[PDB]
Design a protein around this ligand. Structure first.
Ligand SMILES: *[C@@H]1O[C@H](CO)[C@@H](O[C@@H]2O[C@H](CO)[C@@H](O[C@@H]3O[C@H](CO[C@H]4O[C@H](CO)[C@@H](O)[C@H](O)[C@@H]4O)[C@@H](O)[C@H](O[C@H]4O[C@H](CO)[C@@H](O)[C@H](O)[C@@H]4O[C@@H]4O[C@H](CO)[C@@H](O)[C@H](O)[C@H]4NC(C)=O)[C@@H]3O)[C@H](O)[C@H]2NC(C)=O)[C@H](O)[C@H]1NC(C)=O
Ligand SMILES: *[C@@H]1O[C@H](CO)[C@@H](O[C@@H]2O[C@H](CO)[C@@H](O[C@@H]3O[C@H](CO[C@H]4O[C@H](CO)[C@@H](O)[C@H](O)[C@@H]4O)[C@@H](O)[C@H](O[C@H]4O[C@H](CO)[C@@H](O)[C@H](O)[C@@H]4O[C@@H]4O[C@H](CO)[C@@H](O)[C@H](O)[C@H]4NC(C)=O)[C@@H]3O)[C@H](O)[C@H]2NC(C)=O)[C@H](O)[C@H]1NC(C)=O
Ligand SMILES: *[C@@H]1O[C@H](CO)[C@@H](O[C@@H]2O[C@H](CO)[C@@H](O[C@@H]3O[C@H](CO)[C@@H](O)[C@H](O)[C@@H]3O)[C@H](O)[C@H]2NC(C)=O)[C@H](O)[C@H]1NC(C)=O
Ligand SMILES: *[C@@H]1O[C@H](CO)[C@@H](O[C@@H]2O[C@H](CO)[C@@H](O[C@@H]3O[C@H](CO)[C@@H](O)[C@H](O)[C@@H]3O)[C@H](O)[C@H]2NC(C)=O)[C@H](O)[C@H]1NC(C)=O
Lengths: 715, 715
């Protein structure tokens, strides 16, 4: 049944509009929890705002709105209405009471603008406050400048300036995150035309003490940029400021002298620019409302210090450990990239903030609809069962609010399942939550007999899907497929057919007792092994090359380990990244080693979640390099999983190579060094980590009494 | 240097007091970051409030304040001043403008009450609003009732009612957290003397549909408790309400009809009582300010739903998975126990909230100052080095704000170190952050030769401390101590001397090349093995029985695993908890097994952090049972670590028993079943989890070319 309707206005005084919140100004009857989040975007060219808008802001916004999954042309079903009103070209022609009249004239304003968001994106001006004298009815406002009189907390939205309108940021211009300490401990540049005076004297004295390398400037070389009253105006051009910030461990941001100025375009620009190049922001003044602060824990990316504690800032900056400081820089890069960096970022964030505030789940991430190549086949006791999907829509939107917004990958997509589902406590399977659980010995445990009879573990039973990439290797494919006949817990085999030429019509595919789905590929890419094929109906994927020889016992043990390490790559070929001491860079190393940091996906388990991330969220430059060299997709997936988890992979059994006994250049090996170092440039840091152990079954090589059996014969 | 002083008042209008925030009303010059957080508590018996106070509130508050580590009698050094003003006995004799005059008369009010917190704790009344007509100067207010006009967000504090004044809650009366689903999906009891009417009709229709078992009552059997206008008054007595809530999966809380009533004592009592017995709160009305909401992510413990979405509540409650619902119940127990349950909880929370808001670290957790028993001794190349301490004071207070408050153990103590310090990315050790790092092969890696020469890993080098408990076993003690001679990375051996009788004067302790510190125990307890002895100068503890035989290679491998699993018990004797199918309870099981859930601390590594938690934070009832049976401290530590981490332990090597080859009842074994099931009652759930693997060195049992060596000879 529909949510209860908000009673509209039948003109409302300024005190009434300042009291708008979701609980009294939003019409939930337009937004059932299960109806998606349809968004109507007004075309600003049909209204007075269009011709006064900054042209780059308008163009970038229109392009993002056209590409957005939530946007509908059907106003009668929309939950949210979006109007872009600025920023406007300077000098601002349009008068305020006029802006108000055109808002109230919008096609679907109804009496009061309920369920509207007014978006006003900064780019070139730091003095605009377009809506100050404007009654906004029941609409929300999203912009970078607010005085206290106008900001409605939990209702309005503080957003990022739109810097890269109709451009793309170049990540290769971002300084590496390591070394932690840069030339200057901190810097500041500004000019101002209460506590201000002590701040200046304190910071000047830090510089004069020569206890650290700092650069603080309280005038600009040339004329400062125009600003609001009491603001530390920006100096120079963006390119000048960034050159210093790239050399700064920390960037000071001194909030405006007037405490009523909650946030300004100029302040938000200082934040943007510091985060863009890894200078950890140090914000003096707690009265500030940073962009998206209702959703983001800004203390993880920025020091936000009261102005009276300016006398302690030097000590504080010197007291942070390298690992804590690096974590702050890494978090700043995540926040900046995800929520600030592009028009897509900003629009996605506005919509996700409103959607999340009204408890609606994100749109489901897309998948690879596969074209099956039907084929003919040649000549435990239950049939395949799929993993259940979309069981946590509300939990992952609302209950998991902190991680959804403050941990990669962010809040924009709904996945069918993830590796981070909480485990039930171990008594629940016996006391009412036992569906699908298969405890060893019915809960009494046991030795190898009981162990082989039941998956056990801490989660219900499930199956896995083999994904096998093939190209021009038809004979070896049929044979390795035949090796899967009889494999326990196998749901199906997905064969990714990369060759331009289709499978010969006269082909007898082995009957292995589960479906073999051959999927056609629009192009020939190693990246296709990590596409989230529609045909994969499990969470667990066993990724295997068409020439890998794994025994069934090895696969079964790997599966059981993965079921207890669901966020990891769990697999057989362990490798590591080696430091090239003279060249100060990385090398790929596949020697026998006591320490590992990668498990190759030519023989490994991982969660389907990472197929979605690899394919649709991870930077395009990584997939492009994989296709340039036809190499390194295994390295790329290890980078991705270790970035998300901050853990090494898990290596299973004493196996080192995994091809056939009888089965088989240098340039390919050197490409892997180049991949590793390029991926580090894309990420900004090396995410791989080392492990000094492998996993074996509990009773491996253990001498047992006669009434006990090993978990496995050989592993 | 001191923080900048706030300029005082030289009477201030209501608009001014409603604008108080930390940035304009708090004097940071009284609170340097490094001066602790000294708190002065007024004795309310010296002021008019004392004789009007509720006597149980006053008595419980005074007792907590007397026992508090922050409280000082020296007003000239205090950062914060605390005055208890209520709740008052009914009918309220004292008039408002009078309350105001006595506040302004407090000894250290100065002109305006800056740096004061006025505490008004509810217990018996739901109609009091003592400070409504009271000017509070620059003081903060902590209470359970606020209208919008009076609540200053980020400055005032919404707190819990004081239910157990001068009593202790009995955890054995709390229903177990499992089964997830209880008799009633949801319940509500209230009576009210806008959206209200649709809520009633919607919920009545859910009950009438008989699609779930629910019990919703909108009148009380007898006269309802007095309440504020538009509130759903409480029914009956606390004992009546709890009896129904114990049978409720979810508890509805319908917020007051008047949106200006931000929170009330009655609403906060409904929250308290639901959380007390595991009913997951479903709060209808988002305008509410729940207790401690600035610090706590309430969505993790409660569904907070707009009143218009009442028509979707039934669907929502039915859509939550068992594991998500159980996680919400578990989080509610943590929040309730830590911040609501006792006067200590509430006072600790008020002080910690203010302290955290002004960026000051918690007081350091105490330690066991040891009495060394000096002794005489009988007859890699560097000397012992201690682990560094207190490197994250600001980070763990401010940057880690989310986890500090929303994850066990909570925010009240500062530890010297913890197992959750973020790791540096793997290039940082080569590019400026390398102090203490010992990479294998200088970063090039290698095989067993290179591996034995360097700890490697992802953290700098460190040492470990052996902790060995002994009692009446003097001969075997000298011998097992001698087995530690030559052990790499050993900092020292702490011998915990439990026997009432001291060590014979004529005793020659072996010289093993590191200090042997023998510590005297005030009493003979197994719990003493987990005291955070002053003498332990490392993070890593190797806990070993006086009769355990470990080889040096085993210890070294275990240490390397622990260095990469620092939050886990990493050790040798693996055991598990078995379900007793007919009795629906747990058993201790030490058979050979393919699945483990405990590693016994008679031979295991763990972080000193858990010694502090075990000794000083974990429930006393667990330590009491250990002393009653002289048993089960190993089980207790596994419960603790798996509760904190939600992970199983890690078992190292194929060893099952760990006593001497030649070395050695039933009642002791049956005590372990009783311990396991009692500990489950204390926690509310079983925290142990299963693992189906052990760890071995990477090249264990691996065939190698001649130019490569195994990491270890035997493991
Ligand atoms: C098993 O374990 C062993 C031991 O670690 C490991 O051997 C090492 O292998 C690496 C990589 O192949 C070697 O590093 C390279 O050294 C190059 C110079 O090597 C000479 O000198 C050593 C002794 O000093 C001799 O033993 C050796 O035989 C050679 O005569 C050096 O040029 C390489 O640097 C390339 O890559 C880095 C990026 O990290 C880049 O910065 C460099 O510039 C260089 O790239 C080249 O750039 C030029 C232009 O600038 C360009 O023209 C050229 O195309 C680029 N590409 C190359 C390939 O040069 C690198 O440092 C190391 O010496 C070996 N050590 C030993 C003791 O042999 C095995 O590789 C491991 N086996 C497996 C299968 O993993
Ligand atoms: C290695 O692995 C084996 C296989 O799992 C395991 O053997 C099991 O051991 C457990 C525990 O010792 C046994 O469970 C107990 O069974 C009791 C009855 O057992 C009889 O029946 C079986 C066949 O049915 C016979 O084989 C057996 O020899 C006996 O004749 C049962 O009474 C026990 O229950 C106690 O504990 C629960 C708490 O979980 C409690 O609820 C019970 O009430 C009972 O407590 C007793 O209460 C009474 C009053 O109510 C009180 O007077 C008394 O003092 C209390 N204490 C006891 C001890 O009774 C429990 O269910 C199980 O039968 C064994 N299985 C087999 C196949 O033998 C080994 O223990 C493992 N070895 C190691 C070293 O781990
Ligand atoms: C959690 O979110 C997912 C994803 O948004 C929801 O899945 C979607 O559910 C709807 C309704 O069941 C599906 O639409 C329906 O499709 C069927 C065909 O099977 C059609 O007959 C219906 O008339 C309707 O169009 C939709 O396909 C499905 N989306 C996906 C990607 O599976 C799910 O319902 C949500 N669960 C809860 C409990 O809220
Ligand atoms: C992080 O917090 C810890 C714990 O509060 C701080 O440790 C404390 O530091 C003070 C000042 O150094 C110590 O007091 C001093 O003791 C020395 C004796 O060594 C004495 O000569 C001085 O006059 C003064 O009284 C205090 O003992 C110490 N506490 C503990 C438990 O070690 C630490 O300083 C903080 N670190 C940072 C960077 O803020």
């Amino acid at each position: 049944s529909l949510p209860i309707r908000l009673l509209p206005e039948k003109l409302p005084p300024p005190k009434a509009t300042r009291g708008c919140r979701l609980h009294n100004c939003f019409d939930y009857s337009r937004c059932p929890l299960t109806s998606g989040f349809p968004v109507y975007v007004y075309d600003s060219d049909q209204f007075v705002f269009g011709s006064y808008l900054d042209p780059l802001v308008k163009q970038a916004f229109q392009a993002t709105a056209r590409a957005n999954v939530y946007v509908t042309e059907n106003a009668d079903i929309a939950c949210l209405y979006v109007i872009l009103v600025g920023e406007m070209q300077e000098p601002v022609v349009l008068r305020p009471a006029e802006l108000e009249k055109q808002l109230y004239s919008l096609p679907h304003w109804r009496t009061d603008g309920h369920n509207h968001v007014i978006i006003n994106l900064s780019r070139k001006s730091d003095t605009q406050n377009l809506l100050y004298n404007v009654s906004t009815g029941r609409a929300m406002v999203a912009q970078s400048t607010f005085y206290t009189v106008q900001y409605r907390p939990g209702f309005d939205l503080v957003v990022s300036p739109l810097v890269h309108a109709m451009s793309e940021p170049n990540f290769m211009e971002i300084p590496p995150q390591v070394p932690v300490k840069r030339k200057y401990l901190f810097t500041f540049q500004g000019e101002k035309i209460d506590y201000d005076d002590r701040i200046i004297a304190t910071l000047k004295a830090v510089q004069d003490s020569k206890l650290d390398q700092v650069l603080v400037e309280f005038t600009c070389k040339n004329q400062p940029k125009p600003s609001l009253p009491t603001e530390w105006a920006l100096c120079g051009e963006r390119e000048d400021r960034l050159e210093l910030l790239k050399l700064s461990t920390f960037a000071l941001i001194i909030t405006p002298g007037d405490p009523r100025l909650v946030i300004s375009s100029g302040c938000a620009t200082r934040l943007f620019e510091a985060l863009e190049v890894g200078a950890v922001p140090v914000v003096l003044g707690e009265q500030v409302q940073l962009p998206y602060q209702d959703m983001l824990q800004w203390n993880e990316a920025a020091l936000v210090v009261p102005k009276p504690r300016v006398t302690e800032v030097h000590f504080l900056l010197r007291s942070l450990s390298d690992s804590d400081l690096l974590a702050m820089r890494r978090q700043g890069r995540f926040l900046w990239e995800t929520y600030f960096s592009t028009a897509d970022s900003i629009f996605n964030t506005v919509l996700a903030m409103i959607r999340t505030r009204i408890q609606i789940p994100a749109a489901p991430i897309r998948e690879e609809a596969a074209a099956e190549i039907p084929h003919r086949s040649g000549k435990e006791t239950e049939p395949p069962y799929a993993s259940p999907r979309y069981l946590r829509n509300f939990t992952l939107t609302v209950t998991d609010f902190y991680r959804s917004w403050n941990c990669a990958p962010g809040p924009f997509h709904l996945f069918p399942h993830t590796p981070f589902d909480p485990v039930l406590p171990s008594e629940a399977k016996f006391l009412g939550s036992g569906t699908g659980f298969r405890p060893i010995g019915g809960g009494a445990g046991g030795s190898g007999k009981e162990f082989q009879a039941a998956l056990g573990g801490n989660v219900p039973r499930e199956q896995f899907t083999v994904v096998m990439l093939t190209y021009e290797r038809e004979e070896v494919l049929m044979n390795s497929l035949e090796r899967l006949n009889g494999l326990p817990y196998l749901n199906k085999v997905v064969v990714v057919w990369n060759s331009p030429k289709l499978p010969s019509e006269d082909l007898l595919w082995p009957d292995i007792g589960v479906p073999i789905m051959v999927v056609r590929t629009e192009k020939n890419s190693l990246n296709n092994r990590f596409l989230p094929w529609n045909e994969i109906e499990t969470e667990a994927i066993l990724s295997i090359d068409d020439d890998a020889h794994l025994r069934h016992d090895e696969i079964m043990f790997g599966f059981r380990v993965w079921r207890e390490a669901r966020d990891r790559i769990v697999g057989f070929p362990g490798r590591y990244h080696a430091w090239d001491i003279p060249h100060q860079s990385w090398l790929y190393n596949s020697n026998y080693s006591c320490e590992l940091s990668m498990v190759l996906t030519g023989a490994a388990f991982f969660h389907k979640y990472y197929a979605y991330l690899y394919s649709y969220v991870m930077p395009q430059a990584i997939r492009d390099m994989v296709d340039e060299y036809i190499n390194c997709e295994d390295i790329a997936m290890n980078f991705l999983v270790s970035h998300i988890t901050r853990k090494p992979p898990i290596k299973v059994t004493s196996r080192w190579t995994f091809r056939c006994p009888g089965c088989p250049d240098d340039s390919h090996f050197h490409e892997r060094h180049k991949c590793i170092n390029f991926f580090v440039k894309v990420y900004g840091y090396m995410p791989l980590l080392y492990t000094q152990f492998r996993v074996d079954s509990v009773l491996f090589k253990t001498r047992l009494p006669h009434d006990k059996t090993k978990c496995f014969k050989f592993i």
